[PDB]
Amino acid sequence: RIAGVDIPRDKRVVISLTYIFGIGRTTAQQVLKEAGVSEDTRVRDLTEEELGKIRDIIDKLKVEGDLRREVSLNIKRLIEIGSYRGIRHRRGLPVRGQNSKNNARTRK
Amino acid sequence: MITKTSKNAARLKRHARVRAKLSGTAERPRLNVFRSNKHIYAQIIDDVNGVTLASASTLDKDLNVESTGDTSAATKVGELVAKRAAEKGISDVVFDRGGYLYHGRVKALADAAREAGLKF
């Protein structure tokens, strides 16, 4: 729809474009202000040109179809590059130096 | 290129299939048709001697019609081969469609022969 992904239609547009992969709340709000399309709209009943002038700005920033693969390529680069950080990523152990005695059930 | 069978080659199996059940002897000869995409032929065959009694076609040298491939020509060639049966009269003939389906120009030939008077 917007960039591949659909949008929950009955909500505010600022909350709704964060469901796409690549922009959070703060980054969404400033591109939405540059878009100039109100920023307090229900996306169910906006019009087509204010729908469409954000396409060009999300084209020149970057989203899932590119961020997913570049973070994948960078992380497998870190994998086979031979780093301690890469081998920790491989083995599922924590990476940011946290202790493995008592925690990190988020991984493994 | 995908193997598309020849329509005539597929037709031979159905014609042999129907010919296994029936054949045209003396004083009970076999009707025979051809349904080429441009012309319709009719033939009368005696099997015990391998000879033909009478025959007709759309490309006969007379009664040519701009149809020459339609049901009007089918009726005309049917009653043509009906009088061809009549002069050396058999007055009886068994039916044998040539691996076709009894609905179209073959049917036109059939009731052409019927009302012209070759008893089936």
């Binding site: 729809r1 469409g52 396409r55 084209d59 020149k60 920033l61 970057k62 590119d66 570049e70 | -």
Partner: protein, 63 residues
């Protein structure tokens, strides 16, 4: 066509967002297209005009 068991088929034009045309049939009557084959960058030959792309391995601490 066994009638009734097939849905209705009719002429149904295409409006891309870029405004490109296409003489198309569909079961519906009208389709809004967000991105066409003349503007989606892979079918723009090879990234003709839709790109924000590039990748380097840069090792620069000179500031």
């Amino acid at each position: 066509m066994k009638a009734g068991i097939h849905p209705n088929f009719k002429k149904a034009t295409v409006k891309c967002a870029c405004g490109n045309e296409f003489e198309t049939g569909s079961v519906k009557e009208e389709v809004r297209v967000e991105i066409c084959s003349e503007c989606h960058p892979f079918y723009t030959g090879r990234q003709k005009f839709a790109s924000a792309d590039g990748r380097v391995d840069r090792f620069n601490k000179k500031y």
